Design a protein around this nucleic acid. Structure first.
Ligand code: MG
Ligand code: MG
Ligand code: MG
Ligand code: MG
Ligand code: MG
Ligand code: MG
Ligand code: MG
Ligand code: MG
Ligand code: MG
Ligand code: MG
Ligand code: MG
Ligand code: MG
Ligand code: MG
Ligand code: MG
Ligand code: MG
Ligand code: MG
Ligand code: MG
Ligand code: MG
Ligand code: MG
Ligand code: MG
Ligand code: MG
Ligand code: MG
Ligand code: MG
Ligand code: MG
Ligand code: MG
Ligand code: MG
Ligand code: MG
Ligand code: MG
Ligand code: MG
Ligand code: MG
Ligand code: MG
Ligand code: MG
Ligand code: MG
Ligand code: MG
Ligand code: MG
Ligand code: MG
Ligand code: MG
Ligand code: MG
Lengths: 146, 56, 100, 77, 124, 59, 22, 48
RNA sequence: GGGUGGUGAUGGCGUGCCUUUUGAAGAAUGAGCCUGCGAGUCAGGGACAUGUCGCAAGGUUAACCCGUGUGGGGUA
RNA sequence: AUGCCGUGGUGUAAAGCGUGGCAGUGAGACGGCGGGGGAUAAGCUCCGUACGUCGAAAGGGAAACAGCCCAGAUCGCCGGC
RNA sequence: CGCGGCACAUCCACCUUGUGGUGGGUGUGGGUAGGGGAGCGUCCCUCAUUCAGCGAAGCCACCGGGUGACCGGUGGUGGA
């Protein structure tokens, strides 16, 4: 019988990811993996493994100027002609944390469990986060050499 | 013995017109699918004696 | 201590006293079997070498021949009238491992 | 529309052509090449036929050859 | 010899409805609707008995790869390393010992690293 | 001298001559291997089914 | 004509090998 | 002694009768007729 | 701790059944549900082919006759 | 060039052939290659092709996706390639 | 491919060497129309045998079983 995690076997930690020069896609993949728990050998696709992820300095995620001008975020209200266009560039000015979180959410599996997964994600525009009551360990992006 | 659809009492008219009623077309009230209708391939009187040879 | 023991085209991690269900062996209830190992871990040591673990065998005691769950197959294809009904009970053996 | 079916007829295919090829053993009377005109000519031991059929007078092996430009079919016994 | 059908007929109906217990709506109440869902259920079960052999190995590889990159190796190269080292421990037990005995898993990573060629990227 | 032929691709979709040539070599399924003498007939067969097999001069 | 062209162009995928029904 | 219940037909003398149109596991719905035309419902005379 | 039985958070996979079609989950047909009923049968020294059994250069009777019967006669 | 006919070797179990019993089928589809018709249009139409697949073929790939690519499901496995 | 179960065809060796069994090979086992083969269940009759008011049939539940149709056991209900 292959191990299936119980209720209570999930130990959750807290990480802070600095987004100061990280390419937005790299950041989003790392956050999604870390917040799902793909990195821990106890992983099960039907379980909320995974840790809490605080992204800070979301304002300075690395997005190239061409994407800042041309990559468009699309939102349909459900009314006719209710397609609203924004640009990554202007969501960076208004809601940069929304840009980062939207990237994460797109990386997450499209299913009920991910609705609980994304509850463990905090994204902040500034360099400060209110979640210092824990001891959120910084997490840098690394690539395992092959 | 049983009674085929032609030997069952009645069943002469077409019970209703072929088209327009919204029902299955039927042809006769004594068709085998009807309860009280004729029996299809039912037992008929038979003689089961065989002609076994004398020396057998 | 435990070892990764190979039997029935499969392999299982067992520790002395473990009861394991395996493919059918031609051994009656009560007699010993010796089974090759793919790995032995004695705590902090593994030694993970084919020549080294060719000479160690997991010793097991056949507790009995059991029979797997009833699998009920009814192969069905959509608009053809095809139906195939089968059943199947896999024959298994239970071994209490006492070796390593 | 135009009734341009002015040309929609044809005759039956007559299954012409070589019926027994070189080096192939045949019995007497067996037709070797059925054809129109003398596309092949009767060689030794080969008869021609009323419709130019090139049969075998004798049993043996079919062989093809050239006889002064004329291409011929013969049987070697 | 007129034969009533019910005694023989009800046998397969009882079996189908018993197998259809737990189904919702008419699929657990009505033999005709339960039988259709039984054909689907047994087709699905047949499909998934041979699909779970890929499903569990997918899960084993996921766990193995997670443990491997805790020990700073990709699953890619850890599988080479075990092949070259001659370790024939399958991914069932590799994942299960990655969970139960992480130190033994680290030892296996060490032997796999050692068995890897020095330049894992040059032709052989 | 003595060729060693392993079937690596399916006969599904193969032409008559390829299927019958694999049959003639005696190849039955993927990673079946047969040993046959390296004569002209064998190399003609292998040429017909070249894309479906790999061969080696194995003793 | 867009639906037709897009359906026709999706043969040009590696898995299809330049070939596709209709 | 030989009784009425020691009595038995010769092997292969009594073959079973094929009951047509009795489900998919046997000669099923179309009963071997397979068809939608004349043969599906009638006989074609040998002279035709 | 372990095993039954019930339930099933959550993850994956997953286009009803029948008919009929090149092709239907099909937005083609039929079916609201259940129970009951509802379709290759029988006759004939028919015909062909087969399996089997009896007798065999023969085989077999039909009508009919006699028997409580399924038995015995009966050569046309 | 292929293809075809014959022939001699080699290979290949479920080749072939004759003669009986019982069939069904005789609406095909798409894809490759060669052509006609069409406007070298059509998911068009009509042929050819010891060409394929579907039909009657599940599994894997192609997002989904009969007809494309891989591969032909006797059953079981929480083994491997 | 590995390990285990089944089946079909065919081959080789022992047993009354074909009614054929046993062991072992080898190959094979997607399938519509359709062909062939072998079975499950219901009822009735005959023969034998065996249960049944200390409880048959039918039905219900549960536990088991067979490669399938399906089967058995136990209990409840019931009354021939
Ligand atoms: Mg009348
Ligand atoms: Mg009328
Ligand atoms: Mg009446
Ligand atoms: Mg008489
Ligand atoms: Mg169909
Ligand atoms: Mg002409
Ligand atoms: Mg004349
Ligand atoms: Mg349920
Ligand atoms: Mg697999
Ligand atoms: Mg039906
Ligand atoms: Mg027909
Ligand atoms: Mg038709
Ligand atoms: Mg019909
Ligand atoms: Mg059809
Ligand atoms: Mg149509
Ligand atoms: Mg409909
Ligand atoms: Mg609908
Ligand atoms: Mg219609
Ligand atoms: Mg309706
Ligand atoms: Mg016609
Ligand atoms: Mg036609
Ligand atoms: Mg055509
Ligand atoms: Mg063309
Ligand atoms: Mg067309
Ligand atoms: Mg074509
Ligand atoms: Mg398919
Ligand atoms: Mg597929
Ligand atoms: Mg898919
Ligand atoms: Mg691999
Ligand atoms: Mg089959
Ligand atoms: Mg197969
Ligand atoms: Mg059939
Ligand atoms: Mg009483
Ligand atoms: Mg009582
Ligand atoms: Mg009764
Ligand atoms: Mg019961
Ligand atoms: Mg009882
Ligand atoms: Mg009772």
């Amino acid at each position: 019988p292959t191990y299936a995690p119980k209720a209570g076997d999930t130990t959750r930690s807290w990480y802070v990811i600095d987004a100061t020069d990280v390419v937005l896609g790299r950041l989003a993949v790392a956050a999604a993996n870390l917040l799902r728990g793909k990195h821990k050998p106890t992983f099960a696709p039907n379980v909320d493994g995974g840790d809490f992820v605080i992204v800070i300095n979301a304002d300075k995620v690395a997005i190239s100027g061409d994407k800042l001008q041309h990559k468009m975020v699309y939102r349909h209200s459900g009314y006719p002609g209710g397609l609203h266009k924004r640009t990554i560039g202007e969501l960076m000015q208004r809601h940069p944390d929304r840009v980062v979180e939207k990237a994460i959410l797109g990386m997450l599996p499209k299913n009920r469990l991910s609705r609980q997964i994304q509850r463990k994600l905090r994204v902040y525009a500034g360099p400060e986060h209110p979640h210092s009551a824990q001891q959120p360990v910084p997490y840098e992006l690394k690539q395992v050499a092959q | 013995s049983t009674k085929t659809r032609g030997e069952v009492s009645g069943g002469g008219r077409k019970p209703y017109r072929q088209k327009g009623t919204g029902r299955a077309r039927q042809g006769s009230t004594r068709a085998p699918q009807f309860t009280g209708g004729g029996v299809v391939h039912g037992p008929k009187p038979r003689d089961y004696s065989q002609r076994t040879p004398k020396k057998m | 201590t435990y070892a990764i023991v190979k039997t029935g085209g499969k392999q299982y991690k067992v520790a002395v006293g473990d009861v394991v269900k395996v493919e059918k062996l031609e051994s009656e209830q009560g007699e010993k079997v010796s089974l090759p190992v793919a790995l032995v871990v004695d705590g902090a040591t593994v030694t993970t070498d084919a020549k080294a673990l060719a000479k160690v065998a997991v010793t097991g005691e056949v507790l009995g021949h059991t029979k797997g769950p009833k699998i009920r197959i009814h192969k069905f294809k959509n608009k053809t009238g095809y139906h195939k009904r089968q059943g199947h009970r896999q024959q298994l053996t239970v071994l209490k491992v006492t070796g390593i | 529309g135009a009734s341009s079916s002015r040309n929609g007829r044809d005759s039956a295919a007559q299954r012409l052509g070589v019926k027994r090829y070189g080096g192939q053993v045949v019995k007497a009377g067996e037709i070797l090449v059925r054809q129109r005109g003398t596309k092949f000519h009767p060689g030794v031991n080969v008869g021609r036929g009323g419709d130019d059929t090139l049969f075998a007078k004798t049993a043996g092996a079919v062989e093809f050859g050239i006889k002064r430009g004329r291409k011929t079919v013969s049987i070697v016994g | 010899a007129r034969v009533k059908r019910a005694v023989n007929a009800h046998k397969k109906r009882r079996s189908i409805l018993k197998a259809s217990r737990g189904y919702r709506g008419q699929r657990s109440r009505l033999y005709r609707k339960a039988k259709e869902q039984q054909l689907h259920s047994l087709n699905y079960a047949y499909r998934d008995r041979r699909a779970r052999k890929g499903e569990f190995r997918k899960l084993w590889i996921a766990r193995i790869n997670a443990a491997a990159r805790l020990n700073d190796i990709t699953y890619n190269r850890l599988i080479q390393g075990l092949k070259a080292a001659g370790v024939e421990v399958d991914r069932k037990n590799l994942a299960d010992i990655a969970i139960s005995d992480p130190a033994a898993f680290t030892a296996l990573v060490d032997v796999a690293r050692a068995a890897l060629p020095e330049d894992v990227n040059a032709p052989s | 001298s003595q060729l060693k032929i392993t079937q690596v691709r399916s006969t599904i979709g193969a032409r008559w001559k390829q299927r019958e040539s694999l049959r003639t070599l005696g190849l039955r399924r993927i990673r079946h291997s047969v040993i046959r003498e390296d004569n002209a007939a064998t190399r003609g067969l292998i040429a017909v089914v070249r894309h479906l097999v790999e061969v080696e001069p194995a003793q | 004509a867009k639906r037709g062209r897009k359906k026709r162009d999706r043969k040009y995928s590696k898995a299809n090998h330049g070939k596709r029904p209709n | 002694t030989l009784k009425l219940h020691d009595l038995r037909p010769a092997r292969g003398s009594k073959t079973a009768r094929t009951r047509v149109g009795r489900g998919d596991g046997s000669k099923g719905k179309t009963a071997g007729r397979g068809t939608k035309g004349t043969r599906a419902r009638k006989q074609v005379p040998v002279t035709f």
